[model samples]
Target: SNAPEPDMITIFIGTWNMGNAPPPKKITSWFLSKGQGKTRIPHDIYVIGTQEDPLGEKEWLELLRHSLQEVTSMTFKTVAIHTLWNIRIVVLAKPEHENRISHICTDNVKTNKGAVGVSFMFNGTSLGFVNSHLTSGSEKKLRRNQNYMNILRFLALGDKKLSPFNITHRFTHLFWLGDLNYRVELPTWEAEAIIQKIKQQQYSDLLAHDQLLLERKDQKVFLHFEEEEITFAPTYRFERLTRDKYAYTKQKATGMKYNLPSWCDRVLWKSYPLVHVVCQSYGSTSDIMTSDHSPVFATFEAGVTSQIEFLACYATLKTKSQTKFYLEFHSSCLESFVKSQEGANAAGSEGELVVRFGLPKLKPIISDPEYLLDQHILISIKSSDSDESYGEGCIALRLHPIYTPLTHHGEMTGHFRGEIK
Candidate 1:
């Protein structure tokens, strides 16, 4: 088997609403540390999203690049980075897998209120990432749903046009993450009371009133997206610079109304039926206090298919006069002939003849090992006008295991000389 097996790669996704705060000096605790008893492994890919970034894109990107290189031994390369106003999304992958990626595209929706999307093809699978900042406010549930639809409709990648299913169905796997800003439907005090006395199993009761979940249940937004269980508390409305205190707690002290804390930041994913994505760990970190929202992270193991295409082969022949040539296989019926114009070698000029056999098949050559091993290419040369053989040569047909064509047109050259008769 020359065919490469399907690969299962680990992916790490994180989202945070910076609240116009600067990047912290250290982010290892929040970015790389394990949650609870979960084991942390080095990830092959990372997708990070932020909303209301105060230090602009460069500083945050620099911090992420510096921190990621220092923390992990594996060298990483930026796959794609896009920013829409204060909302931004960045993707990084291991250097070994960079060359296999293609069709990188980025697009954004409405100004500040919508989303930014980045999509690319990895191996043979298409992957898309969307970092969105939807409408905020406790009573704007329908507005948030409308924003979601608008983002999906307006975001276009590459030459794709505006359509509801353009971004949704264009990729084999899609991940949407950011400060969605969907609030809890319950009153601030009622939500606070539930959070204060919340048990592990009782979080579901609180989530029952979550506007995002309610909208999703009604099939108004996030149609086919899937989310892991929420083991952590709501990630929004925390008092700035405080680890555990909610902003509402401080506002209550001042006798002022404050927005109810909700799970504003989220990570959701969807994939084609053939592509499998499994969530390993989903949680949030409280170590960073620069933002009003806790950063949420999730690890996934995604299965990606690998494929290669075999197109055409070329045989360069050096001849003193015009000659006709053809190629045949001893073990198979595959045959190819050099075209008349290409077979004309006028003394000094060497003609490169193209030998095309079957249609370009997108599969490994070693799929049929027995046939490949027994295959031998026999080349015959003869006078152009007369049916008289001039010289002949034969060689075993062999293919390199890692022979990737220079272009998608798929071409390879074989240099050979036929002995004079």
Candidate 2:
């Protein structure tokens, strides 16, 4: 009994910062000129390139500015695009967007009025983009962490007491990203219980593929540098740590020149549905003017909401006539599928494609050559990087049974290699 699928919208995110900027030198290193300046940048991000530069403060002037800029038109005489930072956040474009968020203090300490926390609610998605800066070493704040967890739950569900924002409607996929300040043990199965709990609950705690203990959708343990799949560049520390070269692992409270090199600023998300999961370490911490973090960027189609339209939505109203209609529809679907399979088999091998979704059946092929209605209800064709000299291989796909390798021709080349001399 669902209504027609609603079109989804995307919300670009950048969060969690100490709220400071780099000096004139760090600014000079990149901008060439002086720099992007130390104004109140987006989400406290120096907007330098990645996240933040140095540790500073927390405020929502940036967020509100972004949300308001949308929906409202800037009718200026001259179109000074340079002065225009991010016109994308404007919600007034024929209808622009960026839903409301419930207010939840980040730090749990008893004496803080405004700590720092955010929870945005949208129509078809609930994005938990969280950021936590833990105690340097052992100055743990339990209540702060616990309250933040509570904020997570409230944000997850719709906390009426906290605010009127209820993303619970689209909480099907909630993505949490940030610097939790607690790098328990890189990302080991034996070392992390929260991640295990997260995955157990159908939620993924992504971004730890280098350390074998954790495995994500497209990333396996020991496969970080294999492909440049990440987008953020290395937003934290430098590679491997040492007592001498390793600078920012444990530094001071206020920083102008401290080595905070880490892959700390992270981008974690819900299992990728419409968007490809790609993130990288942006390669530095505390860029001086930006804040105490490196920027982490991820790209995804923003307005596309993906949903499975139930073909059986009206199944309960089944009459013999309706049944006949469905049977015909399915029959036609199957026939088309069979023809596709036969073509594939001829192209590769008869046994190459194995369609496994609904039940398996064999109906007589009324037309095509080898139209046997076995269990092949799906067909997919994919050709790799085909080169005349190094011709890429072919693969058979029967989406019904996602695992079954329908076909594999000549193995592969470029990426998926076969046998070589």
Candidate 3:
């Protein structure tokens, strides 16, 4: 419920049906912290899914690639990418974890309906993420079921390419995301009435009629997987220009006639016995209007069989873009791979490197002025090779502003577009 202890890693997962528009620089609340806090805790892993047609496909992927990297300052490096027609999937994780997250591979198969997938390992746990753009049209439910079976049968397995394992069996943890295209079972007018109720906070009333949940209950699709309760209203078929409400009906050019809003953009997950997963949150961003469908994101905390205990290591302040800032680092354990190469050229082991930002205009005015430190704020010194890693990974730093302690501030604007060197 709070900051994860050692041995747990947070993952941020998001999916969007972009209607083929390029990604924007504005980070949606799907990725940012919603709770009141001066500094937000960053997730260790990121998974993004988007839907795009086959035209200029390479350019779309490249744009998305850079957008994610710059947003996260390259801390999350791309480990996997796959596309099937329109559904594209990308998975990123902090680079230091490259060695531990192994057996990386991508797979895809096109059978009219398209699905692409990536599978890998984390701390000896098998993980697979699949992105798919299934067949459309509310009347094609049977065909969609067939397409789902096609994805399960034909999705490639890296080493066992010929004898593909059911994607569900190939990974210890599985994440499925994309424009699933499931429609509301209700008539158009009734669907609108339910949306009005949802806006009034009666969201749970729609679950019994959701076609996706009904299909899952009948075991007709998405076997062995679980989804967070659909707390938000429908995420699809919003009008592009004025995205405050669902797409207008009775017009072919504006939107499909009688198109009912539905939770078509979705994220579903399944995990094995060894890995425990906590679904922290699931929500959609209504402010993003590039597409008729709002983007959905979920945060997950994953814990392995064991863990590490991190403690406060250091803190500092600096300015790179004429904006004042403060930051703190923590340590959980002494891992053998990192060393302080700058101090007298001597090698010393390090535990871990976790970060917390200092709030703007917040500082403890002490009796001495010499205690204040400022410079390039050497965040990078030296890290060495070793099978061992440092830190217990316990995590938070929420400093209150002296003048306006009641308000929570966000990060100051600056250049955080990944490492230049």
Point to the candidate with the largest TM-score: 1
On a 0 to 1 TM-score scale, where does candidate 2 land against the true structure? Answer: 0.35
Which RMSD does model 1 reach against the true structure? 17.4
Q: Give stretches of model 1 more than 4 Å off.
A: 1-6, 36-40, 158-164, 198-201, 249-255, 307-421
C-alpha lDDT values of all predictions: 0.65, 0.26, 0.57
83: Cα error in model 1, Å: 0.8
Clashing pairs in 1: none
Candidate 2 residue lDDT tens string, 286-373: 3333344443433222332311011111111111111111110112223332211111111123322211111123343353432222
lDDT of 3 at 225: 75
Q: Residues 146-239, candidate 1, lDDT per residue (tens digit)?
A: 8887776667863242111245555657899989988777876585576574434366777888888888877778876798878677787887
- Score every model by TM-score: 0.68, 0.35, 0.64
Q: What is the lDDT of residue 176 in candidate 3?
A: 85
Which sections of candidate 2 miss by over 4 Å?
1-10, 19-95, 98-128, 135-170, 182-234, 237-260, 271-292, 302-421
True-structure lDDT of candidate 2: 0.26
Predicted candidate 3 versus true structure: per-residue lDDT over 122-198, tens digit per residue:
76455688888888777777777777778876776533531213565455467888888887777766866866875
**Best-to-worst lDDT order:** 1, 3, 2
